[PDB]
RNA sequence: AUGUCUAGAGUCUGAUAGAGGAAGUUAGAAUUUCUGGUGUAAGGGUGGAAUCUGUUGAUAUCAGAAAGAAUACCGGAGGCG
């Protein structure tokens, strides 16, 4: 049993999946949830629903400890990713900051090669 | 074969644009690996899956260190050779 009132929520919605963590403002992890653990599979793990679920499963596992003041980051391209903060908005849980991290290269590190050659 | 001229072509003077070339320095983002924290059962991937990665602590997240390669925005019905 434990208060910290300030927090972050990283939130990474690539194609596939989307990953949802909740932790300190230092960035130390209290909790975290995936679309692949809320027992989705194939497809439907990259879809804004699962995206909605995900996200309200994570702070539900985080409701007792103490928090209320959150500042969310976003990376990747997901469909969802608006649908991760919205329910975020409707757990109650309020918000004070949403941001991204998505990661922009310099040119740097040559991708990787188109798909059907 | 020997002269003459300046409009062709050059030299000199002045102005000016430019990723022109070579050599020597420097920079940050991002990625990967390694080390140290938080934390748990998935991660990753496809039309759909599996191989693979992960309970020897993954992915995610924070801090530090190292190396390599390439230079987003400017940046195009541009510029130079």
């Not at 629903?49 to 209320?68: C, H």
Request: one cysteine or more; aromatic letters at 6%.
């Amino acid at each position: 049993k434990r208060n910290i009132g300030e927090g972050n929520v990283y939130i990474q919605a690539t194609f596939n999946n989307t990953i949802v963590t909740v932790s300190d403002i230092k960035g130390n992890a209290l909790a975290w949830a995936s679309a692949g653990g809320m027992g989705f599979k194939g497809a439907k793990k990259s879809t804004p629903y699962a995206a909605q679920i995900t996200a309200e499963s994570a702070l539900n596992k985080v409701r007792d400890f103490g928090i209320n003041y959150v500042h969310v980051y976003i990376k990747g391209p997901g469909i969802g990713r608006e649908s991760a903060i919205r329910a975020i908005g409707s757990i109650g849980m309020t918000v004070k900051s949403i941001s991204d991290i998505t990661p922009i290269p310099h040119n740097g590190c040559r991708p990787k090669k188109t798909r059907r050659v």
